């Protein structure tokens, strides 16, 4: 099945998921010189004080930190969005080396990693229904650069030993995702897709301009994870990123001057 090798990676996904060659695929390169400032965009409202993390899972493609999304406890609103979007999970994409790993790029610059906070539109009732709608999801994307450690990431890093291989999970309560946000909420936005199969064109992307800094040691621990299951040949979970896709008939809008 699909993955990030030579034989099963992004360049093959279209055979099982033809929407891979669609009109609104993600990620994309963000050309900062052609993204136009849109004064009509609102400030983003990130309301994560009541968030309830539950569990962390290695799904064979990344690790997901999962939230209780049975009520409006951690929501994203404002920005480009109409209505209320509930946080369901976050995960990352990262590289084998610090010079690649992000999905979005900025003027062709690749960051070491990218965080995706995934939220679904409450008007559709559940995640599975939301992903069938063009405005079903809002994904907040945050770039990671290597420098100073991110204190608020360390709790994540230190549990990764317990979910080394595909299908392992661990309890992961009381984690506060506010500790993963940069200072500024300035953003770019465009309409796109999930970046992994099934590649559904259901996402309003909100990509923050300001990266967070993580330490080399932190990212090194991500790279100790495995794509494989327990007692299978070890294949390090690295380079779990889809490259930039054609922008096609889209515009990327900036919330800032």
Active site residues: 61
- Cβ 195 to Zn ion, closest distance in Å? 5
CB 221, CB 157: distance < 8 Å: yes
* Residue 195 counted as an annotated binding residue: yes
Is 196 annotated to bind ligand? Answer: yes
In the complex with Zn ion, the residue whose CB is nearer, 104 or 116, is 116
* Whether the Cβ atoms of residue 25 and residue 14 lie closer than 8 Å to each other: no
Which CB sits closer to Zn ion, 33 or 59? 59
Measured from the CB atom, is 110 or 116 closer to Zn ion?
116
In the structure encoding, which two tokens stand for residue 151, read together? Answer: 């204190």
Q: Flag whether 33 is marked binding.
A: no
Options 109-117, 158-166, 183-191, 228-236: segment touching Zn ion (CB under 5 A): 109-117
Cβ neighbors of 134 (< 8 A, separation 6 or more) are 191, 201, 202
Q: What's the farthest any 2 CA atoms get from each other in the chain? A: 54
Distances in Å between the Cα of 222 and the Cα atoms of 99, 113, 156, 159, 178 are 15, 10, 10, 11, 20
**CA 5 to the chain's CA centroid:** 20
Does 209 participate in binding Zn ion (rule CB under 5 A)?
no
Contact residue for Zn ion among 116, 119, 150, 242 (CB under 5 A): 116
Between CA 63 and CA 168 the distance in angstroms is 10
User: What is the smallest separation between the CB atom of 116 and Zn ion, expressed in angstroms?
Assistant: 4
Task: Tell me the closest approach of the beta carbon of residue 257 to Zn ion, in angstroms.
Answer: 29
Token output for 60: 């064979």
CB of 240 to Zn ion, least distance (A): 9
Which residue stretch of 42-50, 113-121, 125-133, 167-175 sits at the interface with Zn ion (rule: CB under 5 A)?
Answer: 113-121
Distance CA 186, CA 67 (A): 25
110 binds Zn ion (CB under 5 A): no
Residue 120 contacts residue 136 (beta carbons within 8 Å): yes
Residue 166 interacts with Zn ion (CB under 5 A)?
no
- Residue 105 corresponds to which tokens in the numbers above? 């790029």
Please, which residues bridge with residue 254 across strands?
37, 188
Q: How far is the CB of 242 from Zn ion (least distance, A)?
A: 8
CB nearer Zn ion, residue 38 or residue 182: 182
> What are the φ and ψ backbone dihedral angles of 146, each rounded to 5 degrees?
-90, 120
Q: How many residues contact Zn ion, by CB under 5 A? A: 1
Comparing every residue's Cβ against Zn ion, the nearest one is 116
Residue 84 annotated as part of some ligand binding site: no
Query: Which residues carry a binding-site annotation?
Result: 91, 93, 116, 195-196
Query: Which residues carry a binding-site annotation for substrate?
Result: 195-196
* Residues of this chain that bind Zn ion (CB under 5 A): 116
Query: Which residues carry a binding-site annotation for Zn(2+)?
Result: 91, 93, 116
């Amino acid at each position: 099945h699909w993955g990030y090798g030579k034989h099963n990676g992004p360049e093959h996904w279209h055979k099982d998921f033809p929407i891979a060659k669609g009109e609104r695929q993600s990620p994309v390169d963000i050309d900062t010189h052609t993204a136009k400032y849109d004064p009509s965009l609102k400030p983003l409202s990130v309301s994560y004080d009541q968030a309830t993390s539950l569990r962390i899972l290695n799904n064979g493609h990344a690790f997901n930190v999962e939230f209780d999304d049975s009520q409006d406890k951690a929501v994203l609103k404002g920005g480009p969005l109409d209505g209320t979007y509930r946080l369901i999970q976050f995960h990352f994409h990262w590289g084998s080396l610090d010079g690649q790993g992000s999905e979005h790029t900025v003027d062709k610059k690749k960051y070491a990693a990218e965080l995706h906070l995934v939220h679904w539109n409450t008007k559709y009732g559940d995640f599975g229904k939301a992903v069938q709608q063009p405005d079903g999801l809002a994904v907040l994307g945050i770039f990671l650069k290597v420098g100073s450690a991110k204190p608020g990431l360390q709790k994540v890093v230190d549990v990764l030993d317990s979910i080394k291989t595909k299908g392992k999970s661990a309890d992961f309560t009381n984690f506060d995702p506010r500790g993963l946000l940069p200072e500024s909420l300035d953003y770019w936005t465009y309409p796109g897709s999930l970046t992994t199969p099934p590649l559904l064109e259901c996402v309003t992307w909100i990509v923050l301009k300001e990266p967070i800094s993580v330490s080399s040691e932190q990212v090194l621990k991500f790279r100790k994870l495995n794509f494989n299951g327990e007692g299978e040949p070890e294949e390090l979970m690295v380079d779990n990123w889809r490259p930039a896709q054609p922008l096609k008939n889209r515009q990327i809008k900036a919330s800032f001057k």
